[PDB]
From Swiss-Prot:
Cofactor mode of binding and number, as noted: Binds 1 heme group per subunit.
Residues bound to heme: 45, 69, 116
Biological process terms in GO annotation: cell redox homeostasis; cellular response to oxidative stress
Name of the protein described by the UniProt record: Group 1 truncated hemoglobin GlbN
Gene: glbN
Functional summary from the UniProt entry: Forms a very stable complex with oxygen. The oxygen dissociation rate is 0.011 sec(-1).
Amino acid sequence: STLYEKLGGTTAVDLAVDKFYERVLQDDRIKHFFADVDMAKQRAHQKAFLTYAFGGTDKYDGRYMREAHKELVENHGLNGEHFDAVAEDLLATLKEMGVPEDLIAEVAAVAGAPAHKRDVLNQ
Ligand code: HEM
Ligand SMILES: O=S([O-])[O-]
């Protein structure tokens, strides 16, 4: 039911979040969206993205998502291409960790949920 059950406990979740953070950090498509934020904050974001994706959606109200990403949309040019890149990066990380493909699809449908994409992009 929770993230730690899905992935096999606290080490495993740390592994997932660290790998995801590392991949986004190296991704020239999206790294500039975090340029005005420190490294702990960037990590906390990848944790939040992953947590959401695994189905702790309820922590993140769409109204809060709209507001949280508004400056990205208005000031950094955030668009659907960038959105898809973060989601892609998560799935690549999970695949590298050995996460079963059925779990990967579950999380991909949540991470790329049209309602969430609309909120994040302020559409
Ligand atoms: C998609 C699954 C998605 C969610 C969920 C999400 C959450 C989220 C929250 C809760 C914050 C607020 C953090 C705070 O402490 O104020 C937040 C912040 C930022 N996000 Fe995000 N976010 C999701 C998706 C995306 C995507 C696709 C991008 C693309 C670059 C992105 C970016 C950012 C940025 C930048 C911030 C602000 C900096 C930060 O505080 O981390 N998010 N997001
Ligand atoms: O231990 S938490 O900051 O991923």
